[model samples]
Target: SMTGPIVYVQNADGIFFKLAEGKGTNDAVIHLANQDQGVRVLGAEEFPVQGEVVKIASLMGFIKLKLNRYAIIANTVEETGRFNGHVFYRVLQHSIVSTKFNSRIDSEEAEYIKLLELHLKNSTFYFSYTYDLTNSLQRNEKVGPAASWKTADERFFWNHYLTEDLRNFAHQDPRIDSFIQPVIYGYAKTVDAVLNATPIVLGLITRRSIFRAGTRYFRRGVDKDGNVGNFNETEQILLAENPESEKIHVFSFLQTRGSVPIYWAEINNLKYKPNLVLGENSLDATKKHFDQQKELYGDNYLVNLVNQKGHELPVKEGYESVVHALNDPKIHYVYFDFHHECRKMQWHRVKLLIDHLEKLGLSNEDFFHKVIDSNGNTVEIVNEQHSVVRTNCMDCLDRTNVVQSVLAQWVLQKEFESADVVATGSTWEDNAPLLTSYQNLWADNADAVSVAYSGTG
Candidate 1:
């Protein structure tokens, strides 16, 4: 099976549905959720559920579909309504639909949809169309093959982004990749030789956007406590190749949907902004979330960057609950109310948080490391335990991305200097090219992640 983000599709009947875990191609990417990983036992014995398998018939019925950064998926697939089934997708030109999956004739439009399905299956983009099944708009039935010049143009435009085109250019550029691989991994891909050879390590980052509201996950479905708004999980991976080993050593960590995992929502019916609705069991849910985090990423530090005023009550209270519950000095909570002091002054505000992170004195010395030798002898050593930063705002998109980039910049400074990639006395001001490359990577990461969750970057 190919390794990438797996969009969960459901085929309960003719009506199908989809959900994103914040995956899009920064280059294209599979997996079924057994629902076993982050299961939480609450008031009732509720099993974590998998998303529905979308039907191919429904997809083939469409004539034309428009793509947007936000509003990519059908609207009917909400938090609670998701598991059952959904026929909410609008069919632009409802012609005679394909009876079976393979009965359809090939066209540019059909090919493009299929390609979009593969690359964007695990995406969180809002899948919307011009037609709505439940609304006033009615479907017009036509006969035979549905072909259009517009569809041809659309397909032609997207062909460039397919697999080979999704290749990372930085991999070839020695400026960034050279410094990053050796400094971060302590090993670099070298010329193959019998005397001394290191296997080529594959470095890839996968972003899984959690579908929580701008404000919050207490339950399985989308509710005040479920799939709030723009919660996300950006997973970074390094896979080392092996000649003697079947199972290679993998270094991975998750940059998640920020702050405490509570059940909450931002409801806006009248006001300029949404009012925060706190979950009844916010405290328990948050504790459970951290408990799960400990199971995966281990107990470390949490960097919270939500607002302190307007959106304070919801996230802060729940975050404090986890903090109070754990009460471990090693498990620290670094809180930086992003919008409280820096209204309109976005980039400038990051400095306050940066100064604070510098004060905490981050050390990459103990970063996780695993080594395996020949003869199937396995050796794993975690010289450094990684810290998990839970970032968010009302939505964990705009502000969170900016802050994460800054921290990554700081880490680059540490890793490059430690690896002797830079001169002993060189300052960041002295190293413009490297920082520029670093900034580009993070910016692209932000756009890709944003598109996965909110649709448009």
Candidate 2:
């Protein structure tokens, strides 16, 4: 099996080293002199060294600060769940080691370190030795098995910038590939359950893009790179074991939420509502954003959930104007006044939005569905999701999550129906335990994404 190094050790001279898989102490060892030097494989007998060895779970990446370069490693990890027999781990604690033998921390470097520490402490990151966490289920199915870091989706691979040195060195020497571990900064959860006395597994994974990543007020709208703030791809997966054939059935559905794709900002003034500012050249930026979305997710059903009036009216108008100007048939824009339609605790009215989507030809059956044999090979391709529902509100947190969960539930019911596990026309609500578990999963997911974007859930 392909794998990364299980342990990392540092010598007294500040050089980091590790042994290649299946190599003995008398064999060649991979070593990094410093962040400036490229990783190289040298014979252990030729380059003799002695130091206190530290066993590490995984090497996250390397970053260079003002004073010295630091190596980030996963000091402690907890098993979050399993997907298709692959285990996923959440990085519980991380250790940052400075490369300089006698490093001096200045004021600027101290501040930078503090910020880095806060980011690592606040965010929830997940990784798998075999599975590619950065890509969606559909994408991974298409790409097949390969190195995790090499096949990662660049947008969600948060450590791309930090792992530059190792990645560049891997190009020249492929042996260094195993040392590069890619992690996604977002939320991941998996649960095992039984419906109709049939065993099943449910998993929810969300990957947040590092580009334009920041707190709610600080990062807003789109950047020149067409990356929007708080952009996240949430995937819902279901695995069921067929009692008759003994084959495993796999079902997956994907949805996205992000800030309004335009040059806009909410300037903080210590007021209840921050002052809103909309910049120019929004048309080009909006076009860039949707163009990228179209290429990635086929067709885009943009569901704008911002208010129809008041402080959020400008964003609604700005988004509509750009969509109208582009006039692209591939991009379907739908503006649903969420607060107006579902006011006064009438949240069930969200189904009206689903009805509108159905009229537009996007129903529950339009999602990714497949079946895998006991050997882990895909036996049948039942359905493929052609277009994606891109949802958004002001912060793309609370309201957006509610709508996304609804759409996910809509598709999940269809999955159970197709698998023959549930009777025709039956819903998860028919099973009390299943319904509670489903609701709890979405509720927790909502809080996780909200906390990552805003301080409070």
Candidate 3:
């Protein structure tokens, strides 16, 4: 059966309807009268009214504002790339239409609508018809196959709140599953490259958490729910056809970045440095955050790159204090004075942190590796990543991006070696074109994530 309706019609009564057809005259008409009611499926024999029919790519779900519920539909989409036979799409254009009749907008409603429009306009969102954008490749393999939204990691599902109505109705009528398109509000880029004469596809997908999600100054530190602002899970994927076999090899490494888990805020005054306020006794919240991280990503190596001294000192201290208080074995805290270590454009020193992680057994962590036949059936599972390096600096934008890219490069090199795509000791830097693509991909991703957080790259 098809996942979602191919077309929808809005009649004079403002009823949005679609015809669901099956074999042997088992056609039915699905109609959504209003946001207050569940979608109804009626026999096609009883189907009567119709008006302007519009073909929709996907239903992005609905959102209820102060005045009315708005149905957000993906009217147009741009195909970004494909992974494991599933196509990913960037929402090029969308429509937010009111589902309520004669919906009167008050001043508050007007402001809310404006904010919604601004968010939709400023943010770059991506969705997949068959892929679960929320889960990392490792988690996806563990959970096996299911409906995309069903297996989606709730934290990274940006549209989960908007799809509340549809998800609730899905239980009553499983057909509504077709309409729930889970979206991730972050960055996604894929590039085809030839590395060592082997055709490979390199892709980066960053999923931003909706919890405590906001702009840089407005949102900072951990909420009571253990959710940190600007938290993002980045999955670096490599896909290539095995040289000796008719199977494809897939390698994926996952990492995360977020604000310091302690409760804090940066109040944006007119001054250059906003007032930094640290909330009191954030041990519980910090533990909650790390506990969740440990459960999701197994062992977590918290790579703190914030300044050891100066304006960022309090945050560093606060974070350290919480980690010290928690003293959880799975949560490994490693601090690197980013500015001091990589001073005067000496960025190569970033490897020192990598060396430190290696000494702490990060070198033992393998990326998710799997071989699949031409039919996309898994032939073998080679390795599964058991730990993640959670990199963070103040704002988790620029400095964190550099370090995360370095870590990703390290894992990628290992992946290339394991797949025999490159010599065991060879580095990606040896291949200029592949290096360029890698750099540009991470650079663009940095800008996307940075712009979403700080309003600039």
Candidate 4:
């Protein structure tokens, strides 16, 4: 009965994640599907056939969320590059996997594939995950567990994130009890809270690379705006901070699933000592760099810092030492914001600073130029690195376009080992189109909806 990213591990059987929606983390109504599989009509009916359950693939092969499961369909797929205006993700399946899912056009279910968003009137899904807990190499597996619910071998909220739960931090943080209540429903934890509180995938897998930046939910509390209502702040923060999933109405019936370890990366650092807090929290930035110390870490990060407030720069600054932090061999991933800032990341001279001790696993060889005609005739090739990037978010449609394009480029590499460059973004919304594009590239024929893609490949 335990829900909230439920894992069904039966020894020989690999772990499987089910789409369980409801209150009391343990009472969520469960649905099953592949991480990235789209919707399909199993019955021989047409025109708004009511939704029923269907079998869906999971992150792992040989296993599924539910064998031939039937789910309530929010709506059917709308055919068109635009699909009646609204960005339709409802067509998505409700399952989360940790393995990579293919998005090639030559998918097996070309016929059943419906290019439209799904709408489950009485249902909804939380953002998903790679599902499985194994892997070093995946299509985009570069976006590894480190980028996910990271935990230390000790599983503390904030510690220098070094590596994956498989290799890095293990055990649980002592203060975890304070960060998260015993009751999962009292107040959920954000990925940040999850990361900062439980040493789960977000950091251990990411080595403290990027911030998951989120909290959990249980349909309660009034915000500063004061309006008691639906899925409150905790849940909304988690949803909004997500890279790309503009899921409307909890019951629109759209399902968003992703292949396991869709992306992966490692850190190659040199100066990474066992006890160094890369970015220490400092209320004041006036102390000398040498003042950055290990004492700054604790259960109450703020009180831990406030306890030392008034200290000069190195101690009071939000980040104490910018010294070769993030340096060392590391595997990074999209479990955070998809690492779309690869180019700018280097511009920050991390290679010189952080990488002085660490090496980046993400490749730069993926960069190149392209030539095309945007309504004009001739061909024009511009330059882009074959790296994963973020996208700009417009309205609902723009989110679709961005995700589709990114996925398209990613899938191309999976099939042909070659992909166009990734995109960049300002806010999480800015990357909506790119996220949609990314999912589109990996979507099966049955789940195809042109909204994610920007028409052109």
Candidate 5:
């Protein structure tokens, strides 16, 4: 069987435990919850995200995990006629968590990926655990194709014949009855260097991912009036089926998929208007506000963006239809369907969450706190919580573990693979232009910090 390029055969020998089967299986079994004729998740606070899938696999000493970021599998059991590969599953542009995400691809590379992803009728993404007679886990040993299959055909594959690897020893698994919702968020920034880099670092393989990043538009952007596409009958059926939140207008983003990427993918995309421009004299306000936002974020991506533009003559700045620009490394592609500058609050929330997670360990373990800050005096140590996250982290080495934990979340979490918004930065913008989006961004990040670290700073 072809392994290395498609499947890492060397790592299949690792046998931590055996997966019996579904229901009262060996363990690690998962269950799903719904039928996806069409589903929508608003913001990052829903029960589960749509467009991702999970399942079981195992045979003898071998295990297989055929997962999907989209393409939900039915409970019909991969047997009888239900497992006819493509029949039971519906793969869309947003299913695969790889590039070429939502646009049509007709290239040979695309074809190859599709061919492998086809159900049992074609070759499947199977990882047969190879066993040496001794049975030690090989991190890269497995019997299957290792080549990345990302073509439409392969990406569209949704086989039902799951092996025993999807077993569960826990109370109850979902595939037996339903599916489990995706926990992680997956974000792709216009300029990921400034954001958390969700797409490349953490993907949709695991359930803990969160979809945030990319300096894209605020809200669906192009549809400034909150009226561009979804007001038609076809949209009513597909997008407004059950309508989660009341809607004067059914909002949907206009994605120019493939390479164009975000509506506000870069700083250059910003339009120039007299009112939008703070004027050469207004540059001071621009710089002041820019620096203030940076102080809140602990990073200077936005400030850098606004300042990078030469203002010797003060060209007009783009007053985006909505709050268009995003803090890519942080909140890339932040759009404001209803408001502006909402990302300010969000980054703060993320930071707060991180700090809270750290406090759990810090409050309980003094050594943990000490490890985070090395040259700190005992008195200073007590006041560390009042200091900024970066400050406490610098002073305490134990926070090293805390930083590691954040890195783990940044790298391991998984999420859906569609060109959708988890939570737009719009919600954070209480005041635009004058106060603009910074206030809310500040509030949220501050809230996130206070809760996570329990520190006044």
Candidate 6:
């Protein structure tokens, strides 16, 4: 899929308006005026307003409406009067408002208001009107007579069968109950040459795979061996290099959804849920889970990010199984009460978490190195150290992404340092644009993955 930074807007009606495309804010208002909608476009002559969809239900109620830097998926109407492809739009407009405006900016006195809005919008790394439809249904414009389908039919295919590779494994393996198909959510940006920083391109890829265990969303499926809900694997890769360089550096690490490997399912329909109903075969199932990972990834450092107070059962159960499985003296079970500490203090706690993860070695075990030119003298670098860190949180959505972003940032700092020959900037903080760019990139990624699995970002 082709992905880029974009803004999408919907009016009081359900129709979507591409503010970044079609017409200008002023012209779009003119176009909306001619439409057959009952709701009129306000302030068309006063403030320059982009397009509008007539009579949208409401912003928050709609599945695609999100403001100020959230990514959304949309498709264009084709010749067959249907959407044949998808596009992911990163919103930059102040779409979410707490209150409505009372008056209008009629004249030059309110020009500063426009400038202020621009400031807020421009402050974001990717505040723009252009988003690319990189992800396409076909490799080219090779359309057939039977190509188009209704939006619902297209989405049904995505939700049920798009990731068939992930589902077929369940039928093939008796030991496996449920598994998630891994999807790559990625975005790109261009970096200009400044100080020691060379001109380059950056792509941050978040590979998120969600496993259902045995049960599906909202108490819908069987809780085989009691393992159910919110099991995921997220790995982030940071690719960077100067345009002049022949080779590029890719740094990556992994994170997963929370809860122990044991058999445990919750009856979440009530106001206050009961403790997990631990299955009789909890130990056996838990062992198989870890052993499966070991077989593929060797011994790993499992970082459980949960709360200590309210999450008593999950903490105890996860601890016991981790101890029992790989009791190799390194105390491979690393538990950090997530929001209890990290949310209170941002950088400090993030750094601390990074320091702890470093024990598992954030070395270059998973990076790829290539030789660019054979005729010319080329420089190549490689890191072959495996310090695997398996991180998890309640849903592995918010906090898990934050901590993983930090780890990815740390790797970025090191890579940029190597590229920053003049030593003008030593850490990520020293590069404000870089950090902002990364924040927006990862935040969009988090929202995309969440929306795909949980229906909201």
What do the candidate models score in CA lDDT, each in turn? 0.36, 0.76, 0.75, 0.22, 0.21, 0.39
Better of 1 and 5 by TM-score: 1
In each prediction, how many residue pairs overlap at the backbone (N, C-alpha, C within less than 3 A)?
Answer: 43, 0, 0, 153, 108, 14
Instruction: Point to the candidate with the largest lDDT.
Output: 2
Count backbone clashes in candidate 3: 0
Identify the runs in model 4 with alpha carbons over 4 angstroms from their true place: 1-386, 398-403, 406-457
- Residue 374 in model 4: lDDT: 31
**Model 3 alpha-carbon miss at residue 121, Å:** 0.3
Write model 2 residue lDDT over 6-81, tens digit each, in one string: 5556654455556435453444355555655344566655343555566676778777787467778787788888
- The deviation in Å at residue 357 for candidate 6 is 2.7
Model 4 lDDT per residue over 1-457, tens place: 1112222321111122233232333321121324433222111122122333333322111222222212222122221121111111122343323222333333433322232113222222221122211111121123433323332112112211211221221124321111111111111112222211111111111100111222432222122222112211110111111123211100000011111110111122576522323222211111221122111111101101121233342212222232223221221212111222545642343223223212333332232322223332213222323323221111122332333333333323321122211233222223455334333333322122222235432
lDDT of 5 by residue, 1-457 (tens): 1111110011111111112222332223222212321122112132223332332222111112222212222212221111101111111112222211243544754655465445222211112112111110111112112211111011111221221223231114332211211111111101111112222111001001011223333322121112111010000000111123221111111111111111212233456632333233233333343343234232321100121224421221332211134322321221111111434653444445445534433221111011111221121121111111221111112222233233223211111111121233232122233122222322332232221123433
At residue 104, what lDDT does model 1 achieve? Answer: 39
- RMSD of candidate 6 to true structure, Å: 14.6
- Tens-place lDDT per residue, model 6, 165-255, is 2234334532111112111222223322233444443444232222343324432212444333434444443434544553544333444
Ranking by lDDT: 2, 3, 6, 1, 4, 5
Compared with the true structure, model 6 gives a TM-score of: 0.49
Q: Residues 242-264, candidate 1, lDDT per residue (tens digit)? A: 44454444333335554345554
TM-score list, all predictions: 0.45, 0.88, 0.88, 0.19, 0.19, 0.49
Clashing pairs in 2: none
Error of 5 at 137 (Å): 35
Q: Which regions of candidate 6 are displaced past 4 Å?
A: 1-195, 210-235, 239-254, 264-280, 295-298, 309-311, 314-316, 319-331, 338-344, 360-381, 393-396, 417-425, 452-457
Better of 1 and 4 by lDDT: 1
Off by more than 4 A, model 2: 19-41, 44-49, 100-102, 212-218, 264-280, 308-312, 340-344, 393-396, 453-457
